[PDB]
Swiss-Prot record:
GO terms for molecular function: haloalkane dehalogenase activity. One of its GO terms (cellular component) is membrane. Belongs to the haloalkane dehalogenase family. Type 2 subfamily. PANTHER family: CIS-3-ALKYL-4-ALKYLOXETAN-2-ONE DECARBOXYLASE, MONOACYLGLYCEROL LIPASE. This is Haloalkane dehalogenase. Its EC number is 3.8.1.5. Catalyzes hydrolytic cleavage of carbon-halogen bonds in halogenated aliphatic compounds, leading to the formation of the corresponding primary alcohols, halide ions and protons. Keywords: Detoxification, Hydrolase. Residues 32-156 form the AB hydrolase-1 domain. The gene is dhaA. Pathway: Xenobiotic degradation; haloalkane degradation. It is an enzyme of class 3 (hydrolase).
């Protein structure tokens, strides 16, 4: 059975005049493990993975600005904004070296931070991550029409802001197993107020698809280029059929990325953590152990 509870004391830190919430558990010494969620989730997505890692490592899991229990300033919530606030978050906790565990838009943040801070990243575990999507044919068929509608301002905002489709529709459709009502309520909580749903709409409009938006495409291409030339230890989780990362792409990346271990979690779409948390957690913990082995 998969846990529905969120048994983590809230921690808060001031970041650029706002307050961000984060999970902070595990020993106080050693290399911390920073967990970064994406759209439309929160640190909640890591709730059943962290317990595998916390016995040996500090686990830090922030809620992105505008999401989870973090503050909700009147921003456009561009990727730029998230980058700014996450940089400031990392510096506010005085983190030096880290291991990254990243997912979805959290992966874009993680890879972009790593590229710019290569000496401070001691390993990256990732799953269903942001890469350039050259054309719409390389976006999953079943979600193609939806995300094309998301990527408009009248109808997309109607769907995502007014009707909360990303939470009620897209979110559970990103999990093979059914989310329980308790789980749904945790994911719903930060967005009960419609006006707070801005990040949920901007994020799919920031996705690097078919060359647009060009700035994001460029940035993502840059950190993928960096990732392909980096010797940093890498752990890739993938599922079938996946969403951002289909099996063929995972198979390619497992070989093209230096020093990369790949793990098949079985059936999965986007929120792999919700379909097979125990395997992901366990493999991350053991893989973390292997990072201390010289060979
Ligand atoms: Cl998105």
């Amino acid at each position: 059975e998969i846990g529905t509870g969120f048994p983590f004391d809230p921690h808060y830190v001031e970041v650029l005049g706002e307050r961000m919430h984060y999970v902070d558990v595990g020993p106080r010494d050693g290399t911390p493990v920073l967990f970064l969620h994406g759209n439309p989730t929160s640190s909640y997505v890591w709730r059943n993975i962290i317990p595998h890692v916390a016995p040996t490592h500090r686990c830090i899991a922030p809620d992105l600005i505008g999401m989870g229990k973090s503050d909700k300033p009147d921003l456009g919530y561009f990727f730029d904004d998230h980058v700014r606030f996450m940089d400031a978050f990392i510096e506010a906790l005085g983190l030096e070296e880290v291991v990254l565990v990243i997912h979805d838009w959290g992966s874009a943040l993680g890879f972009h931070w790593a590229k710019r801070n290569p000496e401070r990243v001691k390993g990256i575990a990732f799953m269903e991550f942001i890469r350039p999507i050259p054309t719409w044919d390389e976006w999953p068929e079943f979600a193609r029409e939806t995300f094309q509608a998301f990527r408009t301002t009248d109808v997309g905002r109607k769907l995502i802001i007014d009707q909360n489709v990303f939470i009620e529709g897209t979110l559970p459709c990103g999990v093979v197993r059914p989310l329980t009502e308790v789980e749904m309520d945790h994911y719903r909580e930060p967005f009960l107020n419609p006006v707070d749903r801005e990040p949920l709409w901007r994020f799919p409009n920031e996705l690097p698809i078919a060359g647009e938006p060009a700035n994001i495409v460029a940035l993502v291409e840059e950190y993928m280029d960096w990732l392909h030339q980096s010797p940093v230890p890498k752990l890739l989780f993938w599922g079938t059929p996946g969403v951002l990362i289909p099996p063929a792409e995972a198979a390619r990346l497992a070989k093209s990325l230096p020093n990369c271990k790949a793990v098949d979690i079985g059936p999965g779409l986007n929120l792999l953590q919700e379909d097979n948390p125990d395997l992901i957690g366990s493999e991350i913990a053991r893989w973390l152990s292997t990072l201390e082995i010289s060979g």
